[PDB]
């Protein structure tokens, strides 16, 4: 576990953290596109 699982379990941490991170970054960019698309359509 400390030699054969911990190499993966500590590594999937930061792979979870960046997906956790940029989802906040994505939905910021999502709503900004919806502002301009509702502005151009109108």
């Amino acid at each position: 576990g400390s030699g054969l699982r911990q190499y993966y379990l500590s590594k999937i941490e930061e792979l979870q953290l960046i997906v956790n991170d940029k989802s906040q970054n994505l939905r910021r960019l999502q709503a900004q596109r919806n502002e301009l698309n509702a502005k151009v359509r109108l």
Binding site: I12, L29, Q30, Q32, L36
Partner: protein
Amino acid sequence: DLYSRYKKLQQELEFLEVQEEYIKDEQKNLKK
């Protein structure tokens, strides 16, 4: 499932990263 969890979160990185590059092209295009 433990090797699959490590591979699938890698696949959820660049497939999610290309969406970040995508809105940069969208918001630049909508200003024109």
